[PDB]
Amino acid sequence: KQDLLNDRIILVTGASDGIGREAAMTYARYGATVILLGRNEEKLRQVASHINEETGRQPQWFILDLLTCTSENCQQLAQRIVVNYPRLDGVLHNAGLLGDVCPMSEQNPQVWQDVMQINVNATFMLTQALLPLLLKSDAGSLVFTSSSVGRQGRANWGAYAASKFATEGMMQVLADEYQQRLRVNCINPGGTRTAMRASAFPTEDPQKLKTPADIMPLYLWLMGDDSRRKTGMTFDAQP
Amino acid sequence: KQDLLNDRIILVTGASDGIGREAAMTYARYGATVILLGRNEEKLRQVASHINEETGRQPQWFILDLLTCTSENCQQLAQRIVVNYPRLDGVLHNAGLLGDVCPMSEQNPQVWQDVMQINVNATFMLTQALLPLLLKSDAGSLVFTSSSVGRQGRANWGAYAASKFATEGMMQVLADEYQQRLRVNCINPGGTRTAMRASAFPTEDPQKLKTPADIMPLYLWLMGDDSRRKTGMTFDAQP
């Protein structure tokens, strides 16, 4: 089992914390060559070093701030990747901003715009930049991260709900365009023990939640060979 | 029938052309006091004058460019409305930008951002500004405009599909927050004979399409009293 992802090159955004960190570390343990994207340099250095402890292979990391990056910035990142890696076998878009959790009448419009910029616009721009590398895979897998409020909007979820709906739509468009070329799917992690969840639910007991490690089976499956015919779908990590 | 919307004050965005123009004119014919929002001053003047021909009542219009308006701009507009109108009984968010219809790899990121800004962000900001007026209605009705690609993403629909998914999500959040206070719903017009449709489908015969006038029954129903218990739903004008 331990070589499930041997010779698969997988890029993970939001790899500096929470679910993305766990995904990057888990993929590396299963033999993948991982590329870490994040915003916080110190956190990325820490994750890369912990992957080196666990696997003896030190992954490369890149800084890309999704709030402010331009299309040119994403293209430049892709060019830097091309120098060291001949393809991408997987891209996991896990980075996300929660924004305000409060009624629509109280949503801060600057924060609303930021949520849309990171979760949707920059996620799209990065996708555009990385598509040529993904198409070089024998069976590239592109994964977006949704939420239950990306399937059914609920009170107080504001920009986050709008952005995760947009994410499902973007995934569906891409799956349709890349039939028999790429697998394109969404994962809904479910409520998971991270800082984002704790901010969204400040009074909930985090010990009642599954951890990122607990929800990894779906993350592995989508990057492995058993999911090869599956595209255009949204999967719940906690069904 | 001709006084169905007597003493209902209804604001319509994108009232300068296409479906929005038809909705504004139709609501006025049924007795509504209509407020026209658009970008093109000459078109708004023309629609207001044609409403005056048809009803002998000249509606007010306001310019608000959804690409560049700030939250402050929307608040200022709401203040201007408050001067002349004590409430809003309906708000129809019909304005929209199509953006590029082409594969994801060819989508222009500036255009993508514009589509998200008009269809989602400024639509949200305007909603925030108008909510207090809507809450003054005995039964306020807030209507967003979706598309079939806001329910199922398809190839080439890019930012537009993402934005209409976000629109469905925003509608669902609002419906949940305003239970037994407002009706909040989406209309999917279906393929309708307008300039937007003709650009999206340049080779299609527009005479094969229903016109905006043809799809008005649903637009009237959502503003009239027979839809009073209906919220959180998306309705197809062409089922």
Ligand SMILES: NC(=O)c1ccc[n+]([C@@H]2O[C@H](COP(=O)([O-])OP(=O)(O)OC[C@H]3O[C@@H](n4cnc5c(N)ncnc54)[C@H](OP(=O)(O)O)[C@@H]3O)[C@@H](O)[C@H]2O)c1
């Ligand atoms: N935890 C849950 O219950 C839950 C449920 C449903 C969906 N999700 C989704 O799961 C994904 C991961 O979230 P999480 O719970 O693991 O939260 P998290 O621990 O706070 O991690 C979020 C990650 O996103 C990155 N990120 C945020 N803003 C960024 C920006 N401007 N530029 C680049 N990267 C940015 C962060 O990077 P830096 O630390 O380097 O700033 C961090 O690595 C998100 O898409 C979230 O919506 C989580």
Ligand SMILES: NC(=O)c1ccc[n+]([C@@H]2O[C@H](COP(=O)([O-])OP(=O)(O)OC[C@H]3O[C@@H](n4cnc5c(N)ncnc54)[C@H](OP(=O)(O)O)[C@@H]3O)[C@@H](O)[C@H]2O)c1
């Ligand atoms: N026609 C269809 O087959 C179809 C199908 C599904 C959904 N829809 C939806 O129906 C709605 C109406 O579209 P339509 O077909 O009637 O197209 P249309 O004739 O081109 O009308 C679009 C309206 O949106 C307004 N608008 C565009 N950009 C704006 C901006 N930056 N600021 C303020 N207003 C702006 C335009 O105003 P100005 O003219 O003043 O610039 C125009 O009044 C849209 O939401 C569209 O997505 C249409």
